[PDB]
């Protein structure tokens, strides 16, 4: 049952296997595969309503974007500035800058930098030709400054379908569309987002390792006031079982998305994402939606994400009441030490 | 500086020392003495405003009650029912009955029982003559059903003085007057009350061991939803340093109150109270006042009792939100384990 992401899919026109195992990094934990279904399959709709991951193989959600690539985008993506993170390692740990205040002892592993698409493509072309070890990752929201063709393509997305999803799930509004363009091998460490996400793969292959909300005690997120809030403190490449013992009870659902696939990442679900090794650059556009609002009377017992919501709020409250985020830990410890533990 | 409660006071008329060391139980912790001052002494007023313990030797607060004793009280205290706790050991751990629901695995060490004063005096006279090991402790609020003379004596209390205290400290209303009549040797284990208290000694001698609010982590109170809420889990006679390590850093302020003394027990201050061994029965009447309300803008950093107030509230919140008090510990542990500890 630990098939992983399943056997490599066979490409149409006998073009060989899309990717192969050796492109996947190795980890200490087991994973079961995420269902790869058809948007017309009743099961998929079932999984989405039940807030469980699922790869939809035929939405045509971002059909017009499947022709995107560096040249095309550079050709007409606009003149605006694109946020670009650089890093020494293959892990791009996201950090909230507005929170960097609280922890003056945090050394960023990845640094951001604004630039023009053509600049990213160059910096990317240089390392690419000079064989540098440096890595880049473009993560920018799609604004107004967008090119004419890109705005055209954007209109070609399957809004009929996605909008109905927003309606059936009672979700809130579409908060944004993030454009991600990464280099083969790049990794986004495990974290959970507070919104519903439709992850539409465009170019290259990405391995997605998700974990359910109820595995909060195995993933050890950073403190809410820390810059790395919502990220796992556990280093998947070298898990510290002394500090993070329950990480040995972790079980994730995995899959490899390719051009045309849309992975539903339910709100609060942890996800670890990597661009296959030697798989070339990757392109993905995600859609973020505020989740549906809290029901009239909250039934019992609570769902795992509700508890996570509570914990998060308790930490924020103590942060304000105490007048200083760093006294949160001490107060919490004083509260349980010898009383609840 | 660990004088304890100081050297035994010499009684007027060369009637020898009021009490002696051998009447005091022995404990593993050190104590410094609580100032014994005059109500006219500026220092006392200073200590009260600063919310620090102090024994006031001359208030005449309960002057008329100094003539009380079993016969007198029985003679005219009324026909109402008096709450009476019985127990095998010398420790009368207070338990909140309304909370006994939450912990169906709690075995009461002391059992309550309503009865007529004359009944308490009898049950007390029997054990007293049959040399029983059983112990009793009368703890009853002074109601309306009070006798005529008792109501007279009550009027003789020094309201002028105490009322001014309530006014100077901005305290709230007098919530009640508890009448406590115990047997020599009886002990009330360390706990903290949420109100300002003026502890007026009437008959016999009581040793009072107080601890400041900031020693919360050394006294390990029971969970807020537990019946023994606000009591220390540490057994002073046999302290479990494995479960309660910080109990080895505990330092209390001590004193022995006698007829006529009034001990100010500041709100949230822990107190351990014992009737001297072979010292006869003890009588005390306390006065409970709601503390002053929270100031306009709360300055920083917070005072220790404010933090204790916060912790208490956090526990109550999780108790309601989770829909069940017993899930509080687990949620709290899941919150800090590997994140804040």
């Amino acid at each position: 049952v630990a098939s992983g992401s399943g056997e490599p899919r066979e490409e149409a026109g006998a073009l060989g296997p899309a990717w192969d195992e050796s492109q996947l990094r190795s980890y200490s934990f087991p994973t079961r595969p995420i269902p790869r279904l058809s948007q017309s399959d009743p099961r998929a709709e079932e999984l989405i309503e039940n807030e469980e991951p699922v790869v939809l193989t035929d939405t045509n959600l971002v059909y017009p974007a499947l022709k995107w690539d560096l040249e095309y985008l550079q050709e007409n993506i606009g003149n605006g500035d694109f946020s670009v993170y650089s890093a020494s390692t293959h892990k791009f740990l996201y950090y909230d800058e507005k929170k960097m205040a609280n922890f003056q002892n945090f050394k960023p592993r990845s640094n951001r930098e604004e630039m023009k698409f053509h600049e990213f493509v160059e910096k990317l072309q240089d390392i690419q030709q000079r064989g540098g070890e440096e890595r880049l990752y473009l993560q920018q929201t799609l604004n107004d400054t967008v090119g004419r063709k890109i705005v055209m393509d954007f209109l070609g997305f399957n809004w009929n379908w996605i909008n109905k999803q927003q309606g059936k799930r009672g979700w809130g509004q579409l908060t944004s569309n993030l454009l991600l363009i990464g280099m083969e091998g790049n990794v986004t460490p495990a974290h959970y987002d507070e919104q519903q996400n439709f992850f539409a793969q465009i170019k290259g292959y990405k391995r997605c390792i998700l974990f359910p909300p109820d595995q909060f005690e195995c993933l050890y997120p950073y403190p809410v006031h820390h810059p790395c809030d919502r990220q796992s403190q556990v280093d998947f490449d070298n898990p510290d079982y002394e500090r993070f013992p329950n990480f040995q009870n972790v079980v994730g659902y995995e899959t490899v998305v390719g051009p045309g696939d849309v992975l539903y990442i339910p709100m609060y679900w942890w996800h670890h994402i990597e661009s296959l090794l030697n798989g070339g650059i990757t392109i993905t556009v995600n859609f973020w939606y505020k989740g549906a609002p809290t029901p009239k009377r909250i039934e019992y017992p609570l769902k795992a994400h509700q508890k996570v919501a509570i914990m998060r709020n308790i930490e924020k409250m103590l942060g304000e009441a105490l007048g200083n985020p760093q006294e949160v830990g001490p107060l919490l410890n004083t509260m349980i030490k010898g009383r609840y533990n | 500086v660990a004088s304890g409660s100081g050297e035994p006071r010499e009684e007027a008329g060369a009637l020898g020392p009021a009490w002696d060391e051998s009447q005091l139980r022995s404990y593993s912790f050190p104590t410094r003495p609580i100032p014994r001052l005059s109500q006219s002494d500026p220092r006392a007023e200073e200590l009260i405003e600063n919310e620090e313990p102090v024994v006031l030797t001359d208030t005449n607060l309960v002057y008329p009650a100094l003539k009380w004793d079993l016969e007198y009280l029985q003679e005219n205290i009324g026909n109402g029912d008096f709450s009476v706790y019985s127990a095998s050991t010398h420790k009368f751990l207070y338990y909140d009955e309304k909370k006994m629901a939450n912990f169906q695995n709690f075995k009461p060490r002391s059992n309550r029982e309503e009865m007529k004063f004359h009944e308490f005096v009898e049950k007390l006279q029997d054990i007293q003559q049959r040399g029983g090991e059983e112990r009793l402790y009368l703890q009853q609020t002074l109601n309306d059903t009070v006798g005529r003379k008792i109501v007279m004596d009550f009027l003789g209390f020094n309201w002028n003085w105490i009322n001014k205290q309530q006014g100077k400290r901005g305290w709230g209303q007098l919530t009640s007057n508890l009448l406590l009549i115990g047997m020599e040797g009886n002990v009330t284990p360390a706990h903290y009350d949420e109100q300002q208290n003026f502890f007026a000694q009437i008959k016999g001698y009581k040793r009072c061991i107080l601890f400041p609010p900031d020693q919360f982590e050394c006294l390990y109170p029971y969970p807020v939803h537990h019946p023994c809420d606000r009591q220390s889990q540490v057994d002073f006679d046999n302290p479990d340093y494995e479960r309660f390590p910080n109990f080895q850093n505990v330092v209390g302020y001590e004193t022995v109150v006698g007829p006529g003394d009034v001990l100010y027990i500041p709100m949230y201050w822990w107190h351990h109270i014992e009737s001297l061994l072979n010292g006869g029965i003890t009588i005390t009447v306390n006065f409970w006042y709601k503390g002053a309300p929270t100031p306009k803008r709360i300055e920083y950093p917070l005072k220790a009792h404010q933090k204790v107030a916060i912790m208490r509230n956090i526990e109550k919140m999780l108790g309601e939100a989770l829909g069940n008090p017993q899930e509080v510990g687990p949620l709290l542990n899941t919150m800090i384990k590997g994140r804040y500890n």
Binding site: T141, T175, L178, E194, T294, R312 | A321
Partner: peptide
């Protein structure tokens, strides 16, 4: 309460 279990809307952006 229940003003407790409500969430926010933070994503890695």
């Amino acid at each position: 309460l229940e003003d407790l279990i409500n969430s926010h809307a933070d994503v890695n952006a």
